[PDB]
Amino acid sequence: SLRRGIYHIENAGVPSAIDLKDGSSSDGTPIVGWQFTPDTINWHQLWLAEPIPNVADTFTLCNLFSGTYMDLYNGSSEAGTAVNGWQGTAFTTNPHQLWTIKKSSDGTSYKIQNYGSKTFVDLVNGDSSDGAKIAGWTGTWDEGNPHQKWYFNRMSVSSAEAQAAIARNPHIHGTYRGYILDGEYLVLPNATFTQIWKDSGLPGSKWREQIYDCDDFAIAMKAAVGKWGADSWKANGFAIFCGVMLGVNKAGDAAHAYNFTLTKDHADIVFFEPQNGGYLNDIGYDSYMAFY
């Protein structure tokens, strides 16, 4: 089954993503096809999939920005029925907001079926225009129709995935202990991670013995990303990925505190120096503790 997490949902036929129009929280805001920029946060185009207990392959889909849910208007099975953002909750019993999401016949893209109507999410006429209508539409699980096929591009990691990325890194100390703080994390492109740093007041901060040294920079960066996450998104049930690490050098005579993020492919960690905004594959320290 599709895993719990945050997805950028991209049509299989044309490069249009599922977009809540203007990110609006109003009930009935149309959900439309819209172009996107890879390796950015696409602000109106991120969807938190929450599995429904006891209902196989079925999910609510919550817009990360608005906190409102993908909703089939009045649950109508009529072809052309509006698909809109609407107030709801993560584990609602409202079938208008419940979606069975399973692999299409190509085995890579998914089809998205309303649980009540049994109709499918359809980019009408495969229109690649910004603001193209998305509707519930008659269809089948096995047909090739690209109007109803959707790539679920995973934008989050589970804590287990983050832990695996750390574990395969070559700069981990033998004494390493990791402390996990949340369960599912939006992975930032470096462009956004950098922006948060740039706006944090840290670029302007002076290194000062004990009173504002390694530990203070690293903790301040983590706090900055935490604040950004809450200020930026209205959905709940996920965190923003930003780790803190304490490390020791090879000679075992010097220590450092710093941050880390994740690669685009989610497979590896990358170290971040909060004193200068630099990204490094080797920061010159082996991590003996991390929290994230």
Next chain:
Amino acid sequence: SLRRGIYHIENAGVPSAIDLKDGSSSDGTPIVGWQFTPDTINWHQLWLAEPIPNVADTFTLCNLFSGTYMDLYNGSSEAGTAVNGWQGTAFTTNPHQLWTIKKSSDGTSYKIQNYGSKTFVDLVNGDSSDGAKIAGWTGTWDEGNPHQKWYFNRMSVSSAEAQAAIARNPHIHGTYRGYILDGEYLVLPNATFTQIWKDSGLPGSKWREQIYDCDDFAIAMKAAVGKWGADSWKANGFAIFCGVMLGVNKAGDAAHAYNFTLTKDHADIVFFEPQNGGYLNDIGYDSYMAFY
């Protein structure tokens, strides 16, 4: 010997503290006797004692607020010589700024002798008035004269002392690991710890699943205290005490993240709930990790 740390230096005869007048960083700012309020941060009256390597019982005394040093004017041995704040460094060879500090004949208070002049820090005429002159003055190590006797009231803890306070607490999990970040810490009265919290934006922050939950509040509070430390004091070589803890309940089925501070007597820790500003001797969790 007197230990490295931060001291509130109180005359033995009258309740006047050593005060850098108006906290001014100007060279030549008079150091004077001034009244004080116990259980507050006395902003102009905190002194960081740095031991000089291989000069027994001898220290620089740096005002925490100004970053400037206690300085005997032109190193004169004349009775009545000005004692002022003056620019310097922690390990200076300038004898005007070097002070031999040893127990008086009462075995509890200290005398403070200029390393160059061999004269003593003297509250002139035992004057208890605010702004009373402090001067270098003839004297002896053994005499009873209270004008030249000073209680060194310790306002900081070493990391070892902090570690000991944690270790004697009854709410520590069997699996506990602690991660020490600095070496010497100003202990805040709860009044000041609370003030930092009140101004941090946390009192007005909503708990939100993963995106702004326990860990976010605890880390935000630590970052707030770190920012406050650097913004508040010009001296270097110390940090402000504020810990983060992760804990698990007795039933082992729920976890929490929170902060901790120290008691006035420095012997014990006290838990702090960043979601509501409360202080607790028992927060209902046993700590399995701490950083501070």
